[PDB]
Design an enzyme around this catalytic site. Structure first.
Site, PDB file in Angstrom:
ATOM      1  N   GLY D 143       0.834  -1.315   0.121  1.00  0.00           N
ATOM      2  CA  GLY D 143       0.045   0.116  -0.054  1.00  0.00           C
ATOM      3  C   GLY D 143       0.739   1.241   0.032  1.00  0.00           C
ATOM      4  CD  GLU D 254      15.103 -11.817  26.542  1.00  0.00           C
ATOM      5  OE1 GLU D 254      14.696 -11.097  27.206  1.00  0.00           O
ATOM      6  OE2 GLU D 254      15.459 -13.233  26.742  1.00  0.00           O
TER       7      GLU D 254
HETATM    8  N1  GTP Z   1      -3.261  -9.551   5.697  1.00  0.00           N
HETATM    9  C1  GTP Z   1      -3.970  -8.589   5.233  1.00  0.00           C
HETATM   10  N2  GTP Z   1      -3.639  -7.893   4.306  1.00  0.00           N
HETATM   11  C2  GTP Z   1      -4.059  -6.811   3.918  1.00  0.00           C
HETATM   12  C3  GTP Z   1      -5.218  -6.061   4.437  1.00  0.00           C
HETATM   13  N3  GTP Z   1      -5.597  -5.046   3.938  1.00  0.00           N
HETATM   14  C4  GTP Z   1      -4.884  -4.707   2.915  1.00  0.00           C
HETATM   15  N4  GTP Z   1      -3.847  -6.119   2.785  1.00  0.00           N
HETATM   16  C5  GTP Z   1      -2.911  -5.773   1.702  1.00  0.00           C
HETATM   17  O1  GTP Z   1      -2.141  -4.762   1.761  1.00  0.00           O
HETATM   18  C6  GTP Z   1      -1.752  -4.306   0.244  1.00  0.00           C
HETATM   19  C7  GTP Z   1      -2.425  -3.085   0.045  1.00  0.00           C
HETATM   20  O2  GTP Z   1      -2.144  -2.225   1.050  1.00  0.00           O
HETATM   21  P1  GTP Z   1      -3.076  -1.241   1.948  1.00  0.00           P
HETATM   22  O3  GTP Z   1      -2.918  -1.652   3.629  1.00  0.00           O
HETATM   23  O4  GTP Z   1      -4.464  -1.672   1.670  1.00  0.00           O
HETATM   24  O5  GTP Z   1      -2.751   0.368   1.452  1.00  0.00           O
HETATM   25  P2  GTP Z   1      -2.615   1.547   2.498  1.00  0.00           P
HETATM   26  O6  GTP Z   1      -1.659   1.364   3.463  1.00  0.00           O
HETATM   27  O7  GTP Z   1      -4.065   1.786   3.068  1.00  0.00           O
HETATM   28  O8  GTP Z   1      -2.460   2.564   1.629  1.00  0.00           O
HETATM   29  P3  GTP Z   1      -3.205   3.506   0.456  1.00  0.00           P
HETATM   30  O9  GTP Z   1      -2.516   3.152  -1.045  1.00  0.00           O
HETATM   31  O10 GTP Z   1      -2.976   4.974   0.829  1.00  0.00           O
HETATM   32  O11 GTP Z   1      -4.597   2.903   0.357  1.00  0.00           O
HETATM   33  C8  GTP Z   1      -2.411  -5.462  -0.505  1.00  0.00           C
HETATM   34  O12 GTP Z   1      -1.292  -6.165  -0.713  1.00  0.00           O
HETATM   35  C9  GTP Z   1      -3.256  -6.214   0.399  1.00  0.00           C
HETATM   36  O13 GTP Z   1      -3.563  -7.516   0.313  1.00  0.00           O
HETATM   37  C10 GTP Z   1      -5.648  -6.770   5.656  1.00  0.00           C
HETATM   38  O14 GTP Z   1      -6.568  -6.310   6.294  1.00  0.00           O
HETATM   39  N5  GTP Z   1      -5.062  -8.070   5.914  1.00  0.00           N
END
Ligand code: GTP
Ligand code: ACP
Ligand code: GDP
Ligand code: CA
Ligand code: CA
Ligand code: CA
Ligand code: MG
Ligand code: MG
Ligand code: MG
Lengths: 423, 337, 54, 438
Positions: D143, D254
């Site tokens: 993200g 640790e």
């Molecule tokens: N395991 C897990 N992965 C997640 C989840 N939400 C998003 N992802 C993963 O995170 C990645 C996308 O990043 P996000 O966290 O959704 O994006 P962001 O940090 O909100 O950043 P933005 O681009 O501003 O929306 C993808 O690979 C998703 O599969 C979650 O709730 N659980």
């Protein structure tokens, strides 16, 4: 609250734009008077992307209607959902543009563009956080083509950090009003190359072929063509109008779909296309969605390569079976997907299907085969321009031949840029 | 419709396998860098195993076992036999070998000279050969290595000699291990024979390589075509000359060695619970002495086949190794374990 | 197979088993990089507005 | 007692953080309204659970947590969720528009305008701490916020809290659930700039969690809720030693001491067992030997790779439930005689073992069945470098054409940061090979 401001310009833009608002208002439960009468809170969760909320729980489309002739906008105001639009958002002149890009872009349209920008500014000021703009127009006429691209240039000047998205109808000799359409379209394409982030290429040639060949309509009308555009526009905006994870806003869509800034012209597709009560299985939805006969740009995808693909499945279906069929099309035709963009096919699922369908699929492809569309327009342009045919309509509005030469060179460069990534 | 890629153009074995897969009309070949494959005919060096099994919706299979190089390298095989309790230093079917690092670089120099002082002819070789020295003096052996890692093992001074000819040979066996770690021994082997009489007092009559007998031997093709004797003739010879069969006198020991070696490294290379599956074709080289005792010489991880047996063996690779995972629309001996 | 440093409490215990013995940028510099990227964005927007003014 | 502050960044960090604090409350007997009946020291105390929870005079136990996201829809779930009463508004920070899966947008453009606000809210939590240990930072690789803003936050934390430790829980991108093609770019850009600022990072490949949810829980198409419940179990196993009485991994220092001999190689592999479906009415309870043996199966690792073709630098076993040291040693002895467990020569071949008698807590109504004993293995294997190899390869494919690069340059990032970040990954990939291969 990620609002989109909608603009429809010219005859084609307003007729297609009105049908779009008619379609999605039904999907969101909004009636012709702006009153919500739905049965699911999913209809209202993202309702503010396209609608403003007024007094009395009324929903008003964030739509601005623009034309240089009053005619078509009177038909909109008298149409089914004509009363739902904000009356102050009707911005029209009286002269018309006579299918003349120069009149829309340089003379008649320049006189009206400032009053459109006042309505845009008023809509933007009431946005919690404006995403950007979507414009519906044709490229073959004068107002949507010439004044529409003038609007895009001036909107970019005032909102340089916002996304500009267009539904742009490409002219075809099969569905033609005047011979100057290649001139108007070539002039507009360069504007779109510079000043839009995403453009859905809607080819009247494909719309006609689908109505005649597939839907068995021997005499297709513009209304028949606009039925395909309505369904396509509803499908490509599903991710913006309903809760989801993929391409949920315009900027994230552009980041996923546009690997190079100028190559942002998309081939849309829709399934099913039925000429009708039979249920459609997930393999059938997936096969039809990738078939060339379901494409709206009249380009053979096997003549090029997919840079990026977005697929939206709507309805209650097995998402596991969707993933299986989506991975099946890629793994069985991987020669048509570029290998230097890993996992360039993204799939989204929405539970709410379109009206009158148990399930559907919408295709959004950034394929290098779209160069066939621009080549086609380029050839028709050159056939007339080499003899300077019909240029007096344009030089009479202050344009010089050099601007046509540069528009010609600009679109041949665009064709060459697609060709360098197809190899 | 299954998909596969080819990443070793110099493989005569899998060029035929790739030709057979296309002839079935149910296998499509992709570009060598296309990751959406079901089968990888991979390269010999630095096969990117770490990128396999991460394609959603694709069962992926590769024609090499990761880690099998421990068996298919000179110094690696010696270290594996000495240090594994399953094989032990008291291994009876492997010649007394020692890993010797050159002085310009653990090592077993002082251990090799310890048993040397206690027939004292040895052989020096390495994996960087086409460079082999056979001497009875340890001084020439250690000085030759100093001139990459080498190994010195006991030279079998009493080999089984075929008649007429009084000539040396070695037996090549092809073994296919599938994704379930079934050990399939090809029923057809080859004896790569020397065409020169064995002289226990020149390296042409001592090295039975197919390339050395065609370049430095003046009797090439005299007794058998291409200095290659197949099992039917060799079995008939053992009956007429030694009053015994190939199965009893030799093949029981061969199957025992193949099982011992492959079961030893099974915990280290098995892809049973792995996100991708592996199979591999091996080439075992054996020596037979005058007492009809079989000795293991080396294991080849990327072997070639006999020209007469390419068609049969490659079809067997498709049958039990490729189609067992990707079914379409016996020539092997299963060594159970 | 030696067990060392066994510590026991009410909610559990911990220990170690041995099988075989062995054989920053400053705040100023961060602000400079953040401001350098902002200036490159300003220069690109000024070029766009100059292009649109033409 | 020394406090730990949890920081959740982006959608993945926030939604995983929400699942973790839910599990923490169930484990510590804290109700959604913040009350904790078993806590007899009202309004204060220096118990082991106070490292993660502060206390108000009204007896409310408040997480020492900050949630940051550049878009408000995900954190608004926390504001109106079951555990909304736990957090006060100062802990939940939201912007208006997100980073659009663009590292440079999260790091430079939007990060510059919100970094001071986040640090100020972190400073408010740090001022409540009498002896701050450091930070646990949850975020995704792919993200724009999770990659871009986290790297900016980690840089400023090293400046404002130089002596404090920082640990990561990082979500590695997997196409089966990913939502962006440029995620390999964001992953490598954020690893490059965070590398010198993280003391120990636990990577979680969504591919592994997805497959574990399908294989062991019989979920046909797992959701984020299914994934985050499983992730929070592993995270709980890792942080339990900070929240409960014990002697292993009792402070953040640790973690580096026990798992990270070489500072750049600070990505331990996590393996968890057993994962049993709750739809099974009755399941045969696995023994200490069986769950310990399962710690060496790739199918139970948070990152799919093959530790047989790598070398170990350290190895911890974290048991929860009915486990006594006798059965651990008996299981380890058998495993050594059957597995390819190669340590580097400059490290002892051993296992640091921690046992907490309280069995794993599961969310009522969740997908995970209650088990009598479970284990999480934390092993620093060079085999985890396979995940870097896959990521770097996808980077190389797109960057050779400069695909999507204009999106990053348009945010003020220079093109040279791409290759500079890639060269660092090449050096990291080379360090793993020198340590693990002969
Ligand atoms: N395991 C897990 N992965 C997640 C989840 N939400 C998003 N992802 C993963 O995170 C990645 C996308 O990043 P996000 O966290 O959704 O994006 P962001 O940090 O909100 O950043 P933005 O681009 O501003 O929306 C993808 O690979 C998703 O599969 C979650 O709730 N659980
Ligand atoms: N200890 C020993 N005693 C007798 N002969 C031996 C021997 N070690 C090797 N040889 C002879 O050397 C020949 C080839 O040796 P080696 O197998 O090491 O070379 P190589 O590996 O390059 C051939 P390949 O193509 O099968 O790999 C064999 O034919 C064998 O007769
Ligand atoms: N699909 C579709 N195309 C149209 C419609 N109306 C006009 N066109 C096309 O648009 C072009 C004419 O432009 P038009 O919109 O009528 O001119 P304008 O009012 O000056 O913008 C020609 O290529 C027509 O084929 C319509 O309702 N639907
Ligand atoms: Ca006028
Ligand atoms: Ca207390
Ligand atoms: Ca530091
Ligand atoms: Mg018209
Ligand atoms: Mg060899
Ligand atoms: Mg987000």
């Amino acid at each position: 609250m990620r609002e989109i401001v909608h603009i429809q310009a010219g005859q084609c833009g307003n007729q297609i734009g009105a049908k779009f608002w008619e379609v999605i208002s039904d999907e969101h439960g909004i009636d012709p008077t702006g009153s919500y009468h739905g049965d699911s809170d999913l209809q209202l969760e993202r309702i503010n992307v396209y609608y403003n909320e007024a007094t009395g729980n009324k929903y008003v489309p964030r739509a601005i209607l623009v034309d240089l002739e009053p005619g078509t906008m009177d038909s909109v105001r008298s149409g089914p959902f004509g009363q739902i639009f904000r009356p102050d958002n009707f911005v029209f002149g009286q002269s018309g543009a006579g299918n003349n890009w120069a009149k829309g872009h340089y003379t008649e349209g320049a006189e009206l563009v400032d009053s459109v920008l006042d309505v845009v500014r008023k809509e933007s000021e009431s946005c919690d956080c404006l995403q950007g703009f979507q414009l519906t127009h044709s490229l073959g006429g004068g107002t949507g083509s010439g004044m529409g691209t003038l609007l895009i240039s001036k909107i970019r000047e005032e909102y340089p950090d916002r996304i500009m998205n267009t539904f742009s109808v490409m002219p075809s000799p099969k569905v033609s009003d005047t011979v100057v359409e290649p001139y108007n379209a070539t002039l507009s394409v360069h504007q779109l190359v510079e000043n839009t982030d995403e453009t859905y290429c809607i080819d009247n040639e494909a719309l006609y072929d689908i109505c005649f060949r597939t839907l068995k309509l021997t005499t297709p009308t513009y209304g028949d063509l606009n039925h395909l555009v309505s369904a396509t526009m509803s499908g490509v905006t599903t991710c913006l109008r309903f809760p989801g994870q993929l391409n949920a806003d315009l900027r994230k869509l552009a980041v996923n779909m546009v690997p190079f800034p100028r190559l942002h012209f998309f081939m849309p597709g829709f399934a099913p296309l039925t000429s009708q009560y039979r249920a459609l299985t997930v393999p059938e939805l997936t096969q039809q969605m990738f078939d060339s006969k379901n494409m709206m740009a009249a380009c053979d995808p096997r003549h090029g390569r997919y840079l990026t693909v977005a697929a939206i499945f709507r309805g209650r279906m097995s998402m596991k079976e969707v993933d299986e069929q989506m991975l099946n099309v890629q793994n069985k035709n991987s020669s048509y997907f570029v290998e230097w963009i890993p996992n360039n096919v993204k799939t989204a699922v929405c539970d709410i299907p379109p009206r009158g369908l148990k399930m559907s699929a919408t295709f959004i492809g950034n394929s290098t085969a779209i160069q066939e569309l621009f080549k086609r327009i380029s050839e028709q342009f050159t056939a007339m321009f080499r003899r300077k045919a019909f240029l007096h309509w344009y030089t009479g509005e202050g344009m010089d031949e050099m601007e046509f030469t540069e528009a010609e060179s600009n679109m041949n460069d665009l064709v060459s840029e697609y060709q360098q990534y197809q190899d | 419709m299954y998909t596969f890629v080819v990443r070793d153009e110099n493989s005569s074995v899998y060029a035929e396998v790739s030709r057979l897969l296309l002839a079935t009309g149910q296998w499509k070949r992709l570009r060598k860098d296309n990751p959406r494959f079901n089968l990888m005919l991979g390269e010999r060096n630095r096969l990117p195993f770490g990128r396999l099994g991460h394609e959603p919706g694709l069962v992926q299979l590769v024609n090499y076992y990761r880690g099998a190089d421990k068996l298919c390298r000179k110094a690696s095989l010696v270290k594996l036999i000495k240090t594994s309790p399953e094989l032990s230093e008291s291994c009876t079917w492997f010649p007394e070998s020692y890993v010797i690092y050159p002085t310009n670089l653990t090592d077993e120099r002082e251990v090799f000279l310890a048993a040397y002082n206690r027939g004292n002819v040895w052989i020096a070789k390495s994996s960087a050969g086409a460079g082999i020295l056979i001497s009875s003096e340890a001084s020439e052996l250690l000085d030759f290595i100093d001139e990459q890692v080498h190994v010195i093992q006991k030279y079998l001074e009493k080999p089984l000699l075929l008649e007429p000819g009084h000539r040396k040979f070695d037996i090549r066996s092809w073994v296919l291990v599938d994704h379930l770690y079934n050990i399939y021994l090809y029923r057809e082997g080859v004896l790569r024979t020397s065409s020169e009489p064995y002289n226990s007092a020149d390296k042409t009559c001592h090295l039975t390589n197919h390339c050395i007998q065609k370049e430095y031997s003046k009797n090439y093709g005299r007794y058998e075509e291409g200095n290659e004797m197949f099992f039917e003739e060799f079995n008939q010879y053992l009956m007429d000359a030694l009053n015994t069969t190939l199965e009893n006198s030799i093949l029981l020991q061969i199957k025992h060695i193949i099982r011992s070696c492959l079961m030893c490294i099974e915990p280290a290379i098995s892809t049973k619970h792995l996100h991708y599956q592996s199979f591999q074709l091996f080439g075992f080289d054996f020596m037979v002495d005058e007492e009809l005792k079989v000795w293991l010489i080396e294991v080849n991880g990327a072997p070639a086949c006999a020209q007469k047996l390419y068609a049969e063996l490659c079809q067997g690779i498709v049958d039990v190794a490729i189609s067992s995972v990707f079914p379409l629309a016996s020539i092997f001996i299963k060594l159970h374990h | 197979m030696e067990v060392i440093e066994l510590n026991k409490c009410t909610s559990g215990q911990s220990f170690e088993v041995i099988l075989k013995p062995p054989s920053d940028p400053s705040l100023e510099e961060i602000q400079k990089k953040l401001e350098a990227a902002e200036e490159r964005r300003k220069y690109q927007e000024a070029e766009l507005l100059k292009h649109l003014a033409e | 007692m020394r406090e730990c502050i949890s920081i959740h960044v982006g959608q993945a960090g926030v939604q995983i953080g929400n699942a973790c604090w839910e599990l923490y409350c169930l484990e510590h007997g804290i109700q959604p309204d913040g009350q904790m009946p078993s806590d007899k020291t009202i309004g204060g105390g220096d118990d082991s659970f106070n490292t993660f929870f502060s206390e108000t005079g009204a007896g409310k136990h408040v997480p020492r947590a900050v949630f940051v996201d550049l878009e408000p829809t995900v954190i608004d779930e926390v504001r109106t969720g079951t555990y909304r009463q736990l957090f006060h508004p100062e802990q939940l920070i939201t912007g208006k528009e997100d980073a659009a899966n663009n590292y440079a947008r999260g790091h430079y453009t939007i990060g510059k305008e919100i970094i001071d606000l986040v640090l100020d809210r972190i400073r408010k939590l740090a001022d409540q701490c009498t002896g701050l240990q450091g930070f646990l930072v949850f975020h995704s690789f792919g993200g724009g916020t999770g990659s871009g803003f986290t790297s900016l936050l980690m840089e400023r934390l090293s400046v404002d809290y130089g002596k404090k430790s920082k640990l990561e829980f990082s979500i590695y991108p997997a196409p089966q659930v990913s939502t962006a093609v440029v995620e390999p770019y964001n992953s490598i850009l954020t690893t490059h700039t965070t590398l010198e600022h993280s003391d120990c990072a636990f990577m979680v490949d969504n591919e592994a969690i997805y497959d574990i949810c399908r294989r062991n829980l019989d979920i046909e198409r797992p959701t984020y809720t299914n994934l985050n419940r499983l992730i929070s179990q592993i995270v709980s196993s890792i942080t339990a030693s900070l929240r409960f009485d014990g002697a292993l991994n009792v402070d953040l220092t640790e973690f580096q001491t026990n798992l990270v001999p070489y500072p750049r190689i600070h990505f331990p592999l996590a393996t968890y067992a057993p994962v049993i479906s709750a739809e099974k009415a009755y399941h045969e309870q696995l023994s200490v030997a069986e769950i310990t043996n399962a710690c060496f199966e790739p199918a139970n690792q948070m990152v799919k790779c093959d530790p047989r073709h790598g070398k170990y630098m350290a190895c911890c076993l974290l048991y929860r439930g009915d486990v006594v040291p006798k059965d651990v040693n008996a299981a380890i002895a058998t495993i050594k005689t059957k597995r390819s467990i190669q340590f580097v020569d400059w490290c002892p071949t051993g296992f640091k073992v921690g046992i907490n008698y309280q069995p794993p807590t599961v969310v009522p109504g969740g997908d995970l069945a209650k088990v009598q004993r479970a284990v999480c293995m934390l092993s620093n294997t060079t085999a985890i470098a396979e995940a870097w190899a896959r990521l770097d390869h996808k980077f190389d494919l797109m960057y050779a054409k400069r695909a999507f690069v204009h999106w990053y340059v348009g945010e003020g990032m220079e093109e040279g940061e791409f290759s500079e970040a890639r060269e660092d990954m090449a050096a990291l990939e080379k360090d793993y090979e020198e340590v693990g291969v002969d």
